[PDB]
Amino acid sequence: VFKAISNLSLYTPNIQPFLDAGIENAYSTWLSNLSETFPDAQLETGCRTLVNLVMENEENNMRKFGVCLLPCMAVAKQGRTDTKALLLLLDIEASLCRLKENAEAFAANGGIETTIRLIHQFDYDVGLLTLGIHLLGIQSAVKDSIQRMMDADVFSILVGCVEVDAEGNEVTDLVVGGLRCTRRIVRSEELAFEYCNAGGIATIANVICKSINQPMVMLEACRVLLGLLFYTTRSQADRQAAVEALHAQCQQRAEQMHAQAQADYEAGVVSEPPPEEMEVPEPDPDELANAAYGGWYQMGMDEVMIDAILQAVCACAAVEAHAKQLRLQRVCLGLAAYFASEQMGTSSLVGSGIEQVLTQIMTNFAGEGTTMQLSCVIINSIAMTSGDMYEEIKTSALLSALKTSVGKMATKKPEEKALKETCAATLEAASSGEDPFDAFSKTVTELDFKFTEWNVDPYPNGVHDLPSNVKEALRKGGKLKVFLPEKEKEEIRWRSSQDLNVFEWCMGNDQDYNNRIPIVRIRNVAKGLVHPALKAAAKKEPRKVAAKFTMCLFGPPNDDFPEGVELPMVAKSQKERDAFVEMMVQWRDAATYNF
């Protein structure tokens, strides 16, 4: 029975007649009357046909099927020692939770606590862990939910699940989802420290350091860090008033003591004469660091960590394949500008080639306002820090790019003419033969975080907001080898439709692309040996089928695949394998902002 419904509903119009007959109430009654002794094999079957009924569902259906939300949650709370059904139950919780009124019933009945509990139990299953994250990310928009997640220690999950190393075989959808869900939950200084208190700083630092050749992970990590720095950094002005107050304590103290030292000597109770003049009293350096330094110090970041972060940021921003990934360049320059403006990591910036990073951005994106602010803040702050490192970055290529870029800036609207004047002041002080310390004395050396767009959702219009080169490359496509379930290594050519809505592909020697998957239904794209057709091609060909060459693309069910289409594949290189996963990440991401 269950399988008939699933093959019938495979033709999407057939869902409406199932709803006319009341399928949603049948499922509820079936789910709410299960006994834990009910075989999990058929619970698995039923739930897989239920996610098929809500898979290609938008709005009105999510409201009627909502009557199954709570019944599903009951089965998820029941002691399910397996993970096969558990996935499906959270998958239809996530689908149902697309609709706001369900996500609210889900929070109002313990879903947050149940989900966090289930994640911990089964966090060895990244698929269930990834769906748990997605469920939670949704709750970042529900009222009281951020605080319900804090009470249940959600950051233990978010800190633990974004682990990466140097081999480039991360579980991408988990690391990216984790970083994004973190950025979305951190919306307050308090919340930022709780993430720090859970281990977030060390986690984030290592992510950045290992993602020189993982742009998608780099981008989301730097966005998480930029927001932490934003909520925990007071103005340069408030902190300066704090430092002078501290110095006024010490001065007033060193004077009281110097006056007892004079009285005691003149009175004859001590023998040491006091000094002709006081010694300048230095404040306790720990009290002075707390007053003086920005949110980086309040969170426990130290010189060696920052030097390594900014070295990686600079390395990543200068990979040739990254020069025109503006969203990534913006956040790289943002961290470089933040630490430059707070006089940290300056030597790492200049030593890791900040100059060539600034020169290319101003050349490949001449005129653009955000990169020009951040870039100018870097130039200004570096010029005021050291006349020697400033000279290192002040070069013909940089000034020629600065001149050309300052002139290409907008001038129509009044807000734009203000921005151009600030960059213009940087170009002027550079060209002046007067000392940099005086030339740049009246230019801005403090970061406005809005120019980093760290919290700005991309793709407001959808897939056709993708950068042109990503669209051109998605359409370009590529060739791979697919290790079909029960067949030999077969050639495969893929390609995005002109539509950018369809993952087309031909196989073997075919040249018409008759196999098609709508990009929104591509559930996951995973790196490594995650399919038996790849684990078995490894034992039989270990050097050509290694984890750095392989991947698998999971999609919607099909007449061939009753449980879901899966394409285990292998590339000629890791760079080809990583590039594939990289486009797929942006493509699917941008598709979620359609209609």
Burial class (CB in 10 A: 0-12, 13-18, 19+), 113: middle
Which residue shows structure tokens 């397996």? Answer: 82
CB 336 within 8 A of CB 344: no
Handedness of CA 185, 187, 190, 195 (dihedral sign): positive
Separation in Å, CA 198 to CA 132, 215, 299: 19, 25, 11
> Which of left, alpha, beta for 506 (phi over 0: left; psi -120 to 50: alpha)?
beta
Alpha helical stretches, state H, 22-83: 23-31, 40-55, 60-64, 69-77
Question: Among 214, 168, 178, 177, which residue's Cα sits nearest to residue 198?
Answer: 178
Q: Tokens for 456? A: 């700005």
Handedness of CA 484, 489, 491, 493 (dihedral sign): positive
Handedness of CA 298, 302, 303, 308 (dihedral sign): negative
User: How many Cα neighbours within 13 Å face the side chain of 392?
Assistant: 16
Q: Tokens for 225? A: 């860090």
CB 519 within 8 A of CB 502: yes
Which residue shows structure tokens 């859970």? Answer: 198
E-state strands within 147-260: none
The b/e string for 563-583 (b: 16+ C-beta within 10 A; e otherwise) is eebbbbbbbeebeebbbbbbb
C-alpha 139/C-alpha 209 separation (Å) is 30
**489 forms bridges with which residues in the sheet?**
483
Query: At 168, is the secondary structure helix, strand, or coil?
Result: coil
Give the max Cα distance, the chain. Answer: 106
CB 380 within 8 A of CB 422: no
- Residue 226 belongs to what H/E stretch? helix 215-231
DSSP state of 481: E
Number of neighbouring beta carbons within 10 Å of residue 43: 22
Question: Among 54, 56, 43, which residue's Cα sits nearest to residue 87?
Answer: 43
C-alpha 191/C-alpha 179 separation (Å) is 15
Bridge-based pairing of strands 515-518 and 566-570 is unpaired
Bridge-based pairing of strands 566-570 and 550-554 is antiparallel
Number of neighbouring beta carbons within 10 Å of residue 554: 20
- Residue 340 belongs to what H/E stretch? helix 326-341
* Method by which the model was determined: X-ray
Handedness of CA 328, 333, 334, 338 (dihedral sign): positive
Number of neighbouring beta carbons within 10 Å of residue 437: 13
The b/e string for 489-508 (b: 16+ C-beta within 10 A; e otherwise) is beebbbbbeeebbebbbbbe
